[PDB]
């Protein structure tokens, strides 16, 4: 429960979990947008992927995820992670350190088809997009 392959958008001491990618959303202004991209390319996955949001998580990640929206402005298609990855045994976890919500999930085995998905962290008027890509390594 140490390494979380994800994005930590919070600021305080994340003592329990340590994330690979960090960008404190409180350090940017309303004219800024945080973009955090995670890529997973291995034959068999055993990775714990998650998120640390100090505001509101959209949608109900990671049970729900947004279909990635290139171009446009913000995503709008809600899909379910079990159908987007097409694997029938995924663990879902959640924890909260103060006002910071942490949403995780655990992948085991190989992924049939390379897919990607987006989760949104909105704090006040600022938004941070976490985009994950999981390769099939076919």
């Amino acid at each position: 429960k140490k390494v979380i392959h994800g994005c930590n958008f919070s600021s305080n001491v994340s003592s329990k979990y340590t994330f690979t990618d960090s960008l404190d959303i409180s350090l940017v202004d309303d004219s800024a947008h945080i973009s955090c991209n995670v890529h997973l390319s291995e034959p068999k996955y055993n990775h714990l992927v998650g998120l640390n949001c100090p505001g509101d998580i959209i949608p109900d990640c990671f049970f729900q995820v947004y279909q990635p929206e290139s171009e446009e402005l913000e995503p709008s298609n809600i899909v379910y992670l079990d159908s987007q990855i097409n694997i029938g045994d995924i663990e879902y976890y959640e924890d909260a350190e103060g006002d910071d919500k942490i949403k995780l999930f655990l992948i085991v085995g190989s992924v049939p088809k390379t897919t990607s998905f987006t989760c949104i962290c909105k704090k006040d008027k600022k938004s941070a997009y976490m985009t994950v890509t999981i390769d099939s390594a076919g």
Epitope: L27, H33, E71
Partner: antibody
Framework: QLQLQESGPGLVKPSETLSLTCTVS??????????WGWIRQPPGKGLEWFGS???????YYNPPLKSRLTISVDTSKNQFSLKLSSVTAADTAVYYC???????????????????WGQGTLVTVSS | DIQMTQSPATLSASVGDRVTITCRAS??????LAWYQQKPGEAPKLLIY???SLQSGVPSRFSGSGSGTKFSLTISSLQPDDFATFYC?????????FGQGTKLEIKR
């Protein structure tokens, strides 16, 4: 309360090196997830982006200008500088420093337009 | 890299008229387009970010319209102090690129 201010000579002779320095007050460069860039505007012409630098020291340049361009940062004094070697009359412009974001192709990046600008200083390239 | 095509170059409109400035991107910049107002002798002032959102302290008469590559800036009723040169800029990717600008004169 963030304030940027350019400083440097406003008259440089041709084929020499133009130097400018931006001083940041009201905020710390080493704590900032933003990039620190330089934009110039020739008299009666449009705006041109030169390059930016992160508190790493990592620099990004407009490709057609990478050979003459050099941007450096000094986090212990909240300053970042610009070096333009082999100047010509085409380099006579008002030069601005500004805080802005990064590029899309990056892994973890702030996407933001230039919000805080300097006052701008005119540099005349002439003999 | 990404060419910003702004039009018109000049613009003359009386006080209280509706003024629209357009901007077109070479390729898709998503929604990362900004609008700047530059008075003479001053640095450009950021007016609009992410195509639609207004900077704080900006009068309500300014607005933006985002799309894939076509963008708009509109003033609902002009004021005397609105004369300036307006630039669009994409901050989608490096290198940053600007439009030719639009010099707005108020007709009287």
């Amino acid at each position: 309360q963030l304030q940027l201010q350019e400083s440097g000579p406003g008259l440089v002779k041709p084929s020499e090196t133009l130097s400018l320095t931006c001083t940041v007050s009201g905020g710390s460069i080493s704590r900032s997830p933003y990039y620190w860039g330089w934009i110039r505007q020739p008299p009666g012409k449009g705006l041109e982006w030169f390059g930016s630098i992160y508190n790493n020291g990592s620099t990004y340049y407009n490709p057609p200008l990478k050979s003459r361009l050099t941007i450096s940062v000094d986090t212990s004094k909240n300053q970042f500088s610009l070096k333009l070697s082999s100047v010509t009359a085409a380099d006579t412009a008002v030069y601005y420093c500004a805080r802005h974001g990064g590029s899309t192709g990056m892994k973890v990046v702030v996407i933001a337009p230039p919000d805080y600008w300097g006052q701008g200083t005119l540099v005349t390239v002439s003999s | 890299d990404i060419q910003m095509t702004q039009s018109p170059a000049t613009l003359s409109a009386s006080v209280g008229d509706r003024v629209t400035i357009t901007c077109r991107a070479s390729q898709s910049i998503s929604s990362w387009l900004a609008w700047y107002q530059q008075k003479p002798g001053e640095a450009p002032k950021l007016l609009i970010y992410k195509a639609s959102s207004l900077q704080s302290g900006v009068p309500s008469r300014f607005s933006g319209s985002g799309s894939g590559t076509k963008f708009s800036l509109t003033i609902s009723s002009l004021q005397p102090d609105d004369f300036a040169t307006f630039y669009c800029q994409q901050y989608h990717s490096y290198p940053y690129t600007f439009g030719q600008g639009t010099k707005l004169e108020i007709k009287r």
